[model samples]
Target: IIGGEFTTIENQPWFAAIYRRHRGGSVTYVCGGSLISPCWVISATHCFIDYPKKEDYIVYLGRSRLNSNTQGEMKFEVENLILHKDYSADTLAHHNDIALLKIRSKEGRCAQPSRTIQTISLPSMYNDPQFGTSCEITGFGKENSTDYLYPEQLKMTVVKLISHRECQQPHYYGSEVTTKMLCAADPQWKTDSCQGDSGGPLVCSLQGRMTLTGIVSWGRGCALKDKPGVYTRVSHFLPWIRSHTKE
Candidate 1:
């Protein structure tokens, strides 16, 4: 996040850092995800669309920093990478961009929430957020869009939700904005999710509970004044998630 500051895993326990291991003997960070269950995590489909094999992906829970991903963190091998069939990065853009990762450890164990890690709640369809409602987003994304430094520690910032009309303005996203998508940005546009923030959680406190309401999808630029970040509205995919996660 461009204007975000460091945060701890205790404050955002549901965070899951998704990484990709390449065949050429190199490993790299991909995007963020949220642990919706002990064994299943939710992320954006665009990140994993090209990597179908489970061996290519790894996930970490209870992590609050980068470069030291294994220190005091639970690492899990991805057992499966399931992308939403409706999402097509080529044609449909970010429509139905959510994906699922069923993960397991080398020790054959599922995640057990510790003091700094726990599953996040999914929002009900009725939890429609009103305009300008502030929600939180966290990730290990770049600290500066121009400098492009992927910060070592986790970071978070609050963004207020925007209306469909406001988001569809010509100077903003225009007709490219879809119904399945929602927009959010800082009131002053000072803070914004930047490059490599994809698949992270946009959590909203609705009805006294923190709910996973959106997934970091795309934007024209980082921390730009008019271009609020676009997210995959998660409530629209509740059936797809329930049907696949089967919980």
Candidate 2:
């Protein structure tokens, strides 16, 4: 989370941190996700490209800092990992890069809501915010690629939506940018999600409720001018999300 401000789970209750446990019994953070339901989390498909087994991944909810294990936080075992069948890992753009993680406790019960944990509302497929609208992205990703330090605290930053045409122009993403992929960036290219932020939420508010609008996908680099961060448009996948989250 480069050039972002400190944020908290109290502010973004749906925020989730996903970790991958190695064979050596060490657990490390992988990506960010959002709780869309008590038992389901939405994230990026590319994050799970290694095809991790269920035990390889764990989901953390209601945590504000990366290194902490406070009482308010909740951790769950990933019962299932579902990637979009159409996701093309062969492409540089990584289109359709969204995933759903079915989560549960050791005893099989789903998340129980608390002040620091809740679901983020999903958006309508037919209605999206207008171009240039300001939205937010939150994560604990690195401040820069070369930096050895990753932020321990969660971060939040606002970025303006970039249209496909504007993002696809010659010097930009070119033909790589697709309609299913949405772009957003700081006006001056000062803030963005980096490597570890992949799979985090890009939320936009309407009617006073924040909606999970996008999933952090990829970009040329962190905070690079003209290379707006690309995300998987959540609205376009409402059907997939709905079908999988239901019994």
Candidate 3:
């Protein structure tokens, strides 16, 4: 989250950090995700490359500080990967950009809930976010596009949902912006999701509950003028998610 401040795991309980392991024994966070269920995580299809091996992926839940150990941290191994069949990296349009990961403990159990770790509810299929609605994004991404590294603690910032029409204007992403996606930005372009934020949650409050509304998918450049970040519209794929999660 760009231009963000430190946030607690208790406040953003569904947030997760997805890490990739190096052959040399080091693990690095590659993207962010949301825990939709005890064993299910939702992310972007673009996050995987070369059909990532199961052993190479590790999911960390209930963690707010990445640089040090936390008392309630839970780690899990990925058991399965399900990327959207039509996602294409060549197009640069970031179409159908969602994926699901099934994770489990070595003993084959789903995660247990706690103060700093829990599941978030998905928005109803009938729920649609209005333009200008306030929303928040949480992640451990770099402060901006040109930053040399990601921050050590979870962070969050506010962004307003914007019209897809304005997102596809002449200087913006153009016709590439579609109904299956949504746009969000700070009006002044002072903040946005940057590198390491892909697959994170774009959450908004509805009826007093924080719900998953979008998935951080892509952008032309981090927080550029008129080029707000594009996200996979979660409500548009409720059937697909339910089919996989059986919830």
How many backbone overlaps does candidate 2 show?
A: 1
* Candidate 2 structure quality by residue, lDDT tens digits, 38-84: 99999998899885587799899999988778578888999999988
Over the stretch 1-247, how does candidate 1's per-residue lDDT look in tens digits?
9886789898999999988888797878899999999999999998888877779888999999876854568999998788889876533246778999999999989899888779999988746588789999999888887765688889999999999999999998888888889999998989999878899999998878899989999887788888999999998888888998874
Report the error of model 1 at residue 93, Å.
4.4
Clashing pairs in 2: 1-141
Q: List per-prediction Cα lDDT, in the order shown.
A: 0.88, 0.89, 0.88
- In angstroms, give how far residue 201 of model 1 lies from its true place: 0.3
Residue runs of model 1 more than 4 Å from their true location after superposition = 69-71, 90-93
If scored against the real structure, what TM-score would every candidate get? 0.95, 0.96, 0.95
Q: How far is candidate 1 from the true structure (C-alpha RMSD, Å)?
A: 1.7
Error of 1 at 137 (Å): 0.5
Q: Tell me how far the alpha carbon of residue 11 in candidate 2 is from the true structure, in angstroms, after superposition.
A: 0.9
Candidate 2 residues lying further than 4 Å off, grouped into runs, are: none
For candidate 1, the lDDT comes to 0.88
